[PDB]
RNA sequence: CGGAGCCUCGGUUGGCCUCGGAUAGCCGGUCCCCCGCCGGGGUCCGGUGCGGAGAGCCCUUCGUCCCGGGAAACGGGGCGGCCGGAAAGGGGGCCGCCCUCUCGCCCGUCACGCACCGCACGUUCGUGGGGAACCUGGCGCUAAACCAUUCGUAGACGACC
RNA sequence: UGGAAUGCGAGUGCCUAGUGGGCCACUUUUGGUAAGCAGAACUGGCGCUGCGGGAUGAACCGAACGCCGGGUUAAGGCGCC
């Protein structure tokens, strides 16, 4: 057993300078530092974990504080390996900052 | 202090650009910032390259500035500096750099086994070296 | 004029519209350094019409077409007669190049000119444009290269990689 | 993805383990084996689009597959709840293990190294990315 | 916009940004078209870009209304008093300027064309001065494959 | 407008903020620099006003 | 987990614009030696800059603000605060995970120093353009702790230079212990020189 | 100092235990020669697009069983002591011990484990931080502060002596 | 052979509110030393108008607005904010 998904971080939204478009996060990825190097992780799964004071279902698994929100990687960002993320609900500000999972799936190798 | 210069026949290691990773011979300088090289053993057309995307190496080439391809091709071989080259420590660097990059992961895998069992041999060793630095001493 | 990216040396053949009067005109040829083609065309029509009793509407351009250099992978050295207009006054130039076309030895020419004397291209005008041997050439920036025996190292190579690894553990070094 | 190929699977109890991929079933599912005594994974399916295909590939043309490993012999059965109900391994499904697996177990054992590979598990380290190495 | 310049940009048919028109060339219409100089870039087209113009962003003026030419039936029933029966006889006679090209180019639709992509140079001055306004000849042939 | 008549200012800014002391013994904001060629003794003392 | 940098032979504002960057995105850095860091310009006219700084004070009660540190650790700390929205919660918890210290104090002294080599004077001014040192001045805006710094600092690299003699030691034994165990390895070698791990 | 759980708060999903530094220069060996309280200088030998490379290194985990071949035997695990650290101090190493196993590592043989029938929040840091309690044994501790009263070195009242 | 090009459906009649302080910019321009001054022409604006950019701003630059998803742009930008 061991880690199966690449660190991301939560940079932001996708915005002007005084404008914010929530539905869209630019996520970035450790290792990817050029605009090049993002073609392997598009469309990838992303999935945001969290911990609540209420406990929720697991599939396969018992109840537990852990949630999850999923996306997927849809498109680069930028020339130095940004990647624009997108949500099944836009991710709450209190997760800029911190580790937004990137899976190894829907693999294309 | 400087030991490699800039000179007509000095064979240089293209770094980056759209023919890095291959050797040229300075045929003129044109500028400050230019060279007029040549690569006609290794795949290069006579053109104007900028200083910035060049590696001096210590190989010197025979031939007068300008002289047109045939007589940079004919002193490249009497050096043989491809050979020359691949028997270098640089070369090797360079190929052991993508015989790393270029590893599968059941290549990997194999090599952590290899690195497991060296490790610990030499370990083994290095604890037995120590302890009889520790008599001699005593 | 823009000098976009490198130009281009330009043949620009026009003459006036043939009239009763004068049937077959003759054919003014110009050189002309431009990015494309369709700003070559204008900038000959800038020209003729300083020179002769011409412009677009009563002439036409017979023939435009590129340059090519003869010795792409010969080094020379070009001798560059130009006017331009300063803030307060114009003035003639001669300034000399090492490239290996003509066309780069002129794209050379409006970068210098814009940064020693903050020329834009629009008040340049290339005059004259020719190879000159090494015996000839004044300007000491350009006959220093003229040494067979020419060497030279180059000291202290700045790290221009420096993003990659942006954080490292060794300092670079720049002697090499 | 050819047949021998060693797939890395990305889903499921079984994330992580190293199996050998046998033929793509008519529903387009992926079968593959373990082998069931390397790795503890049975003739099992599986989705191509959750396998990172290696190039590590053993040879296994001459290996039979038993026609009736199908579709619907591998589709999972109802079980009724009125407590629970638990599965069960049937005895043909033990005779249909062993029946791939002695045939592709001594190819893998050709390959020197190859059982042990087939026993460890893939996981990411501190370093590792995935656009910069070769599988 | 000034009241010149609006007037022979409606002339011409181009009410919005980035809408296309064709425009058969000759002493009064050349005039025209440097009033609105500053407003319009413009050029020859080659067979290609009058063929991609018309097959994806074609649209007919049938009954003052905006219908996609999808199929020939809908050439045919408005320009078929001048033998044009097919999107083939439409391109042939905008790419040739034949003797109906008046009918069979106010029949099509203005293109309305998207931004260029890739961007621009500078829309506020001339092409000859690095920009992208005024007549760029062939070269309107690169901004249409960008916006077509 | 300046100020017709010059004058200095009253007080010292100095002595800021005139307020009640903290603490009622005195105490020795800097003792004396350490000379270590000196022989060892003391730097302060503790008196009463009589 | 910590980003630990070393301030000596680093332009004070590319650094600050990268550290800034990097605790924005939730990782905690600590910078040492921040009196060893530089300044482009030569130092008078780099002491002129802060001592116009110290003139700006509220005329009715300078004890109000601005605050003018003397340390160059706080000199760098305020400049890295310069490049960060700190008056909303986000830039404020991106300002906790800085840490910035005058030498190297422990736990950091025993531990490995990365460096920027974008900020770095070697790599980012010309050899002969002058440059300040925020050490000097520091000390000559009123810093008080320079000699007890670099006392301290001269004990430090004393003992790292011990460490370091211990450390070739262990190296030697390392390359002698290889050629008396040469022979049982040859076959392991052989794979990491296969696979380019060793040349 | 040494058992179960119950809440609550979270983020994290291997570790790098260190020369000083130069950059028109470096690094490592060599101490045969010269100085010092093993360190420094010289000579010489090697590297220098840094390979004694952070482009790096270390660790690497499916578990068990059976018998082999390499590797170890100066070995792994585990109760008592002496140096050692202060800028914001070390669950490192060293010596004993009575114990404790020849398995830990590498290449093979041998087969087995819920093989849960394609599917997510999996995998650590995790005896995490904080709050209540319930137990359960060992060794210990039995204070101040504020009010009130008094003083006047103090004082609008608080405060202060 | 509806006699140049281009574009567009036109004509016509009653009843009619608010307004009748304006102000700004390119160019031209009168008075004035000049003025964020007073007075004109043309066009376009603000007024009545949000929106991207010019840090900030009636007018500048871009572009004008139904509620949305995707893509691409303009003017402007890309050390960090
Ligand atoms: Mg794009
Ligand atoms: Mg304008
Ligand atoms: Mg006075
Ligand atoms: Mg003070
Ligand atoms: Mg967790
Ligand atoms: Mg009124
Ligand atoms: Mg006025
Ligand atoms: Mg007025
Ligand atoms: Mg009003
Ligand atoms: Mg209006
Ligand atoms: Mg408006
Ligand atoms: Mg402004
Ligand atoms: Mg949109
Ligand atoms: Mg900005």
């Known amino acids: 057993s061991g880690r199966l998904w690449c660190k991301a971080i939560f940079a932001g939204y996708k915005r002007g300078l005084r404008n914010q478009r929530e539905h869209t996060a630019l996520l970035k990825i450790e290792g990817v530092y050029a605009r090049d190097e993002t073609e392997f992780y598009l469309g990838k799964r992303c999935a945001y974990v969290y911990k609540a004071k209420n406990n929720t279902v697991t599939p396969g698994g018992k109840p537990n504080k852990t949630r999850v929100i999923w996306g997927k990687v849809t498109r680069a960002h930028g020339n130095s390996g940004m990647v624009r993320a997108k949500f099944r609900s836009n991710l709450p500000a209190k997760a800029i900052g911190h580790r937004i999972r990137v899976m190894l799936y829907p693999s294309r190798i | 202090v400087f030991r490699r210069f800039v000179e007509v026949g000095r064979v ?29 053993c290794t795949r290069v057309r006579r053109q104007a390259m900028p200083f910035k995307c060049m590696q001096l190496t210590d190989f010197i ?58 490790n610990r041999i030499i370990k083994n060793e290095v604890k037995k070296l120590q302890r009889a630095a520790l008599l001699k001493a005593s | 004029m823009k000098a976009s990216g490198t130009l281009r040396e330009y043949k620009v053949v026009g003459r006036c519209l043939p009239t009763p009067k004068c049937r077959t005109p003759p054919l003014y040829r110009m050189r002309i350094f431009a990015p494309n083609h369709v700003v070559a065309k204008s900038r000959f029509w800038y020209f003729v019409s300083q020179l002769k009793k011409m412009k677009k509407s009563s002439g036409e351009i017979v023939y435009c077409g590129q340059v090519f250099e003869k010795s792409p992978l010969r080094v020379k050295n070009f001798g560059i007669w130009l006017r331009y207009d300063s803030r307060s006054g114009t003035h003639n130039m001669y300034r000399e190049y090492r490239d290996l076309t003509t066309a780069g030895a002129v794209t050379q020419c409006y970068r210098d000119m814009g940064a020693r004397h903050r020329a834009r291209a629009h008040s340049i005008q290339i ?33 221009r990689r420096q993003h990659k690894p942006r954080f490292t553990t060794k300092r670079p070094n720049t002697f090499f | 993805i050819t ?17 050998v991929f046998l033929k793509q079933l008519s529903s387009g599912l992926l079968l593959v084996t373990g082998p069931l005594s390397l790795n503890r994974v049975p003739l099992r399916r599986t989705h191509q689009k959750f396998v990172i295909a290696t190039s590590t590939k053993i040879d296994i043309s001459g290996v039979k597959i038993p026609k009736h490993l199908t579709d619907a012999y591998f589709k999972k059965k109802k079980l009724r709840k009125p407590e629970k109900e638990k599965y069960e391994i049937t005895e043909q499904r033990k005779v249909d293990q062993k029946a791939v697996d002695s045939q592709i177990l001594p190819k893998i054992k050709a390959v020197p190294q190859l059982q042990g590979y087939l026993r460890s598990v893939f996981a990411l380290t501190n370093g590792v990315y995935p656009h910069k190495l070769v599988f | 916009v000034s009241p010149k310049v609006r007037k022979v940009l409606q002339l011409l048919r181009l ?87 008046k009918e069979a180019n106010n029949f099509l639709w203005p293109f309305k064309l998207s931004s260029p992509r890739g961007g621009m140079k500078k829309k506020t001055t001339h092409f000859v001065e690095g920009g992208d306004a005024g007549n760029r000849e062939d070269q309107i042939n690169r901004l249409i494959r960008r916006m077509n | 407008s300046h100020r017709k008549f010059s004058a200095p200012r009253h007080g010292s800014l100095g002595f800021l903020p005139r307020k009640r002391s903290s603490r009622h013994r005195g105490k020795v904001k800097s003792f004396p620099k350490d000379d270590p060629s000196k022989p060892v003794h003391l730097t302060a003392f503790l008196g009463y006003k009589a | ?161 011990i460490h370091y003699r211990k450390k070739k030691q262990l190296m030697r034994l390392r390359k002698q212990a290889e050629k008396n165990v040469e022979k049982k390895i040859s076959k392991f070698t052989d794979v990491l020189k296969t696979h380019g791990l060793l040349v």
């Open chain 7, 1 to 161: 987990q910590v980003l630990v940098l070393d301030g000596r032979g680093h332009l004070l504002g590319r650094l600050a614009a990268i550290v800034a960057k990097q605790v924005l995105l939730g990782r905690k850095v600590v910078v040492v030696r921040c009196e060893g860091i530089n300044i482009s310009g030569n130092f008078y006219r780099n002491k002129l800059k802060y001592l116009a700084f110290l003139r700006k004070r509220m005329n009715t009660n300078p004890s109000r603000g601005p605050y003018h540190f003397r340390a160059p650790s706080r000199i760098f700390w305020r400049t890295v605060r310069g490049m960060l929205p700190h008056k909303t919660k986000r830039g404020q918890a991106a300002l906790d995970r800085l840490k910035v210290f005058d030498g190297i104090p422990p736990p950091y002294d025993k531990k490995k120093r990365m460096v920027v080599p974008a900020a770095l004077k070697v790599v980012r001014l010309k050899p002969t353009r002058k440059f300040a040192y925020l050490g000097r001045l520091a000390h000559e805006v009123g810093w008080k702790y320079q000699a007890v710094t670099a006392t301290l600092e001269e004990k430090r690299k004393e003992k790292a230079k």
């Open chain 5, 15 to 101: 009410r919005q940004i980035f809408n296309g028109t064709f425009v058969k060339l000759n002493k009064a219409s050349i005039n025209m078209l440097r009033i609105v100089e500053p407003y319009i870039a413009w050029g020859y087209p080659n067979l290609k870009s009058v063929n991609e113009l018309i097959y994806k962003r074609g649209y007919g003026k049938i009954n003052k209304k905006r219908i996609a030419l999808t199929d020939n039936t809908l050439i045919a029933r408005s320009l078929g008093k001048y033998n044009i029966i097919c999107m083939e006889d439409l391109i042939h006679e905008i790419y040739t300027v034949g003797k109906h090209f």
């Open chain 4, 3 to 19: 047949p021998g190929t060693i797939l890395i699977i990305l889903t499921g109890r079984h994330r992580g383990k190293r199996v």
């Open chain 2, 12 to 40: 240089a290691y293209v770094s980056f650009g759209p023919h890095a990773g291959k050797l040229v011979a300075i045929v003129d300088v044109i500028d400050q910032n230019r060279a007029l090289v040549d690569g006609p």
């Open chain 3, 127 to 159: 005059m004259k444009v020719e190879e000159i041997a090494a015996s000839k050439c004044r300007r000491p920036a350009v006959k220093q290269f003229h040494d067979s025996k020419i060497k030279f190292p180059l000291p202290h190579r700045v790290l």
């Open chain 2, 61 to 118: 080439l025979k031939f007068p500035h300008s002289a047109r391809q045939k007589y940079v091709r004919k002193a490249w071989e009497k050096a043989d500096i491809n050979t020359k080259w691949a028997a270098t420590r640089w070369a090797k660097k360079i190929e052991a750099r993508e015989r790393k990059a270029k590893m599968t992961d059941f290549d990997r895998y194999k090599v952590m086994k290899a690195k497991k069992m060296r």
